[PDB]
Write a protein that binds this DNA or RNA. Structure first.
Ligand SMILES: [Mg+2]
Ligand SMILES: [Mg+2]
Ligand SMILES: [Mg+2]
Ligand SMILES: [Mg+2]
Ligand SMILES: [Mg+2]
Ligand SMILES: [Mg+2]
Ligand SMILES: [Mg+2]
Ligand SMILES: [Mg+2]
Ligand SMILES: [Zn+2]
Lengths: 65, 83, 116, 66, 177
RNA sequence: GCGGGGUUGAGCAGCCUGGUAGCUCGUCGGGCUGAAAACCCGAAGAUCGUCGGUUCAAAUCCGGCCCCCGCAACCA
RNA sequence: UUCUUCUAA
RNA sequence: ACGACCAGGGCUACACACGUGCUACAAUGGCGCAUACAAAGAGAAGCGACCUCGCGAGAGCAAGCGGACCUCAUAAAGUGCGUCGUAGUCCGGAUUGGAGUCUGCAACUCGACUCCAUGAAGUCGGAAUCGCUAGUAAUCGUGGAUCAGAAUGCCACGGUG
RNA sequence: UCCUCCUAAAGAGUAACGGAGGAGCACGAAGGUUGGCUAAUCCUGGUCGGACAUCAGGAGGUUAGUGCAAUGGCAUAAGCC
């Protein structure tokens, strides 16, 4: 699951939530009642802007006819 | 509702402050934990705060509030909406 | 065949046909015919007019169709404007008398709006 | 007015519940006995009563005495 | 001509006094009464209008001219010229005889009666009103009719101002307030 | 440069010479199950790429228009 | 006649 | 202080979903009058007759009773007669307004009940699914426990069957 | 191929692979005559009625209408019954 979080100070609060997150619990998919140790993972990556619609300039070119 | 033969109910420590706030002559908010007290005609016009489990919300008392108790103007469940 | 603003039908028995007025039920229509002297199981057809012309005054003793709706809508707007708990019940659409709102409030809430 | 298209217009008697005897030119035909009219309506009597504002402090000093 | 007899003797001298007219011809007089049932739900067939036009002819004794659509609107699903409503202009005699039966019988028999308005004189003296149910007339038996018709009475007079048409209907004791 | 199309969450009919929004997949909620599939039941969902205009009225008719599927850009 | 699966203490 | 004390609140919230129930969707039924038959319980700070007041919930006086005596207690379904005659109805009772009573320092949140007015959905319910083998299922009443008050729950009890 | 304006230079005509649009009909009444008739849009009021049906009132002065394109016309109406 990938969510965009629009808000103020989003990455300032959640940048320390990366990496693994481990449960030790009795699962809901366990019939024997034994306790399993599972893990998840969270990526918190800051929303950079767009790359940029490329603006070419005919001074950084060399045209061969 | 209460029986007619008992009359309306009000708390003494409020009734000791209704009598005080009449004779004092002020528009001061008096904060009150008695939600269960019937409003009297000498209480009209007083901004008073009824407790609602968390805070004290000031209530202006009008003419048409006499038969009603104080707690009807201080909501306790701060519900907003599911969506 | 027409009392106090509405048209009472002509085939029913006496108190039963009277209850079509917004303001009388089975008990008050027994009290309307208690002062009009009419038996409560005669039809509205084959009556006498002087019975009926006094019968309209008995209904006019009380509060009825246009007036009873005007007082009730005034007493609702009395609660709507006080900002009391019951007025907040009426204008959210929730049940007033203190019922279960976790389940079975279908009369004040109507048909179900599914979660989208 | 043409002789065929316009319906029947027979002057009748308009009786009432309060004793109003009036003679209208009408298209009913049969005898007319009314219910309310301009004579005895609760407009000049009871429109002031049927508002029913009601007193709140005035209701309060009924239900006890001190 | 009962109210027209009643107009020509008391009401004529009355409006000379309470407006101070120069001449006798300056008095506001009523010209016609229009009875309209614009029934836009008669697009299915003529029959719902054919049963309604016969109802309004029983209200006051004229066969009503079926009015048609002036232009076309597809927002109301009518082309130009659909039979859409019926009107009756009562002039001369039959105006007053309806104007007596309306002000005495059919108007006080209206349910939740709280009088008429004084704000409905269309800017220039011609008072208009509208009734909800056709069964306020004693022409209309409740068992015999089946659809709740309703019409709107339009009174057209020769009043220039707004108060002069008010004082004209106040001479006939018209139920305002 | 000439043709075909842009339609609920998705994919397509219906486009008809203009008055009337369909299906499938999916989604939601039940049922069966110990549970999950598959199945079964009951639901809903559209401003017809877009913008002007023509008629009473436009997904439609038209005109420009945005994306693309193509087709063709040749003889020396 | 048809009918699949049950991961890791 | 994750210990202790008091006030007010919450455990009663509400787009939704599920389970267990109650009352209905009526005529083998409703309503009105009359009339017939239970069982098993409970009762002292109590059950409370009788009588009066009140439309009623109740109130007042106040016996009798620590109970095979007295009291809650009237059983209801049924029966007999009468009307309603297939309708959103004299079905249904939600909801809502006013008015009360009772309990309790105290009924706003948040009590039950009564009166008057009001009269939603519902005309027997899809996929499916549950109980039951004889005094049973079905159906109608009664009481107790809990409790100042406050059951459509539970635990009991009999009638028809 | 036909139709209308512009190009077209105040008679007529006038070109281009110049700018723009339409037609391959319709109608037994949409024709003839006689007799009447005056629109569009906005405003104020009025039962369901709502920006918009239908009814009055006034402003308004062809902004409408013309079986269809555009142009020229049309109230003595060629418009509407
Ligand atoms: Mg459409
Ligand atoms: Mg599955
Ligand atoms: Mg030239
Ligand atoms: Mg020239
Ligand atoms: Mg022509
Ligand atoms: Mg001519
Ligand atoms: Mg209007
Ligand atoms: Mg011609
Ligand atoms: Zn009368």
């Amino acid at each position: 699951i990938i969510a965009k979080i629009s808000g103020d100070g989003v990455y300032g609060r959640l940048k320390f939530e990366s990496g693994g997150h481990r449960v030790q619990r009795v699962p809901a998919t366990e019939s024997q009642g034994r306790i399993h140790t599972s893990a998840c993972t969270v990526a918190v990556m800051p929303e950079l802007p767009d790359a940029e619609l490329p603006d070419i300039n005919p001074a950084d070119l060399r045209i061969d006819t | 509702p209460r029986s007619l033969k008992k009359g309306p109910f009000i708390d003494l420590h409020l009734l000791k402050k209704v009598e005080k706030a009449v004779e004092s002559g002020d528009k001061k908010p008096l904060r009150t934990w008695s939600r269960r007290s019937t409003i009297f005609p000498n209480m009209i016009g007083l901004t008073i705060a009824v407790h609602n489990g968390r805070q004290h919300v000031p209530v202006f008392v009008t003419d048409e509030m006499v038969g009603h108790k104080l707690g009807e103007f201080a909501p306790t469940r701060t519900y907003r909406g599911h969506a | 065949a027409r009392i106090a603003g509405i048209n009472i039908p002509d085939h029913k028995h006496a108190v039963i046909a009277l209850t079509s007025i917004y303001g009388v039920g089975k008990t008050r229509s027994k009290a309307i015919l208690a002062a009009a002297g009419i038996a409560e199981d005669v039809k509205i057809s084959e009556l006498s007019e002087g019975q009926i012309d006094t019968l309209r005054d008995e209904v006019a003793k009380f509060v009825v169709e246009g007036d009873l709706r005007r007082e009730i809508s005034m007493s609702i707007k009395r609660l709507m404007d006080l900002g009391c708990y019951r007025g907040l019940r009426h204008r959210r659409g929730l049940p007033v008398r203190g019922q279960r709102t976790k389940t079975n409030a279908r009369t004040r809430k109507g048909p179900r709006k599914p979660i989208k | 007015m043409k002789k065929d298209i316009h319906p029947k217009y027979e002057e009748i008697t308009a009786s009432c519940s309060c004793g109003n005897v009036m003679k209208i030119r009408s298209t009913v035909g049969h005898d007319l006995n009314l219910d309310v009219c301009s004579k005895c309506h609760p407009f000049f009597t009871g429109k002031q009563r049927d508002v029913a504002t009601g007193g709140r402090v005035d209701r309060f000093n009924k239900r006890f005495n001190i | 001509a009962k109210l027209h007899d009643y107009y020509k003797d008391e009401v004529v001298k009355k409006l000379m006094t309470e407006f101070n007219y120069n001449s006798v011809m300056q008095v506001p007089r009523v010209e016609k009464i229009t009875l309209n049932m614009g029934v836009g739900e008669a697009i299915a067939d003529k029959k719902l209008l054919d049963n309604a036009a016969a109802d309004l002819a029983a209200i006051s004794g004229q066969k009503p001219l079926i009015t048609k659509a002036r232009k076309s609107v597809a927002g109301f699903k009518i082309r130009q010229g659909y039979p859409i409503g019926c009107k009756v202009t009562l002039r001369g005699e039959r105006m007053w005889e309806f104007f007596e039966r309306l002000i005495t019988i059919a108007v006080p028999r209206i349910r939740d009666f709280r009088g008429l308005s004084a704000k409905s004189f269309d800017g220039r003296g011609n008072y208009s009103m509208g009734v909800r149910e056709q069964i306020i007339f004693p022409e209309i038996d409740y068992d015999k009719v089946d659809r709740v018709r309703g019409l709107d009475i339009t009174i057209t007079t020769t009043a220039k101002s707004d108060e002069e048409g008010r004082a004209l209907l106040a001479a006939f004791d018209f139920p305002f307030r």
